[model samples]
Target: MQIFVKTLTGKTITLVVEPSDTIENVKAKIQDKEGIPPDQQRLIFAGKQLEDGRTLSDYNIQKESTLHLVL
Candidate 1:
């Protein structure tokens, strides 16, 4: 499945990922796209940093939908 995320600039990128992909993996993809280091990347959703273990279901994430990120 693919997930869409909006950057701080309001630019959006669509990333295809398995449903089981961890949040860490998603962060890595964002880092890869933006040239930011994984350790320096921070993913914020719904006013909090998303942890490594949280699943798509845990956060009520939808397949083929947008997930907001603040850099």
Candidate 2:
């Protein structure tokens, strides 16, 4: 599935990931692409903080969902 990510700085990035991917996986991908350390990353979806251990689908995320990444 493809998802959209927006950073605090208003930069937007698109990522393709498995529906089974964890929030941690998303952070790692963000680390690789944006140079933000996973430990310093916070992802928000639907106004809720995304848990690292939880899969994207667990959060009811679907294709094209937009997440906010705060560093």
Candidate 3:
């Protein structure tokens, strides 16, 4: 599936992440794209708290979905 990621720095990157990918995987992807460390990364979704161990299915993240990420 494809998802849109917009960073706090006003940089947007599109990634084709699999449904099997966990939040941690997404964080790693963001880390790679924005040059941020895994431990230093925090992702806020829809003003709610989310953790890396959680899966995208837990957050209702569907295909072609768009989400926001902040460093």
Candidate 4:
């Protein structure tokens, strides 16, 4: 499945991920897209910080739901 995220510029970024993909893996994809190192990037969803240990499925993240990325 794919997830969509909103950047600070209001631009929507697309992330292709599996249900079992870790949040860190998601960050790696974002890093490839934006050139920001995963360690330097912060991901937020539903007003909470996304932890590296969690899987997308753990959060119940669905297609088209909005995620926020911050530096």
- Residue 15 miss distance in model 4 (angstroms): 1.4
Off by over 4 Å in 1: 45-48
Highest TM-score against the true fold, candidate: 2
Quick one: how many clashes does candidate 4 have?
Answer: 0
lDDT, candidate 3, 1-71, per-residue tens: 88877777768878888877788898888888878777876776677556889887788788877777664
lDDT of 1 by residue, 1-66 (tens): 888878778888789887777788888898889776667656665666677777666666668767
Full ranking by lDDT = 2, 4, 3, 1
| Residue ranges of candidate 4 with Cα displaced over 4 Å | none
Model 2 TM-score?
A: 0.94
The residue-by-residue lDDT of candidate 4 on 1-21, one tens digit each, is 789977777788888888898
Please rank every candidate by TM-score, starting with the best.
2, 4, 3, 1
For model 2, the local distance difference test gives 0.92
Enumerate residue pairs that collide in model 2. Answer: none
Residue 30 lDDT in model 3? 81
- Separate clash counts for every candidate: 0, 0, 0, 0
- The list of candidate 2 runs beyond 4 A from truth reads none
Question: lDDT for model 4, on a 0 to 1 scale?
Answer: 0.85
TM-score of 3: 0.81
Per-model TM against the reference: 0.75, 0.94, 0.81, 0.88
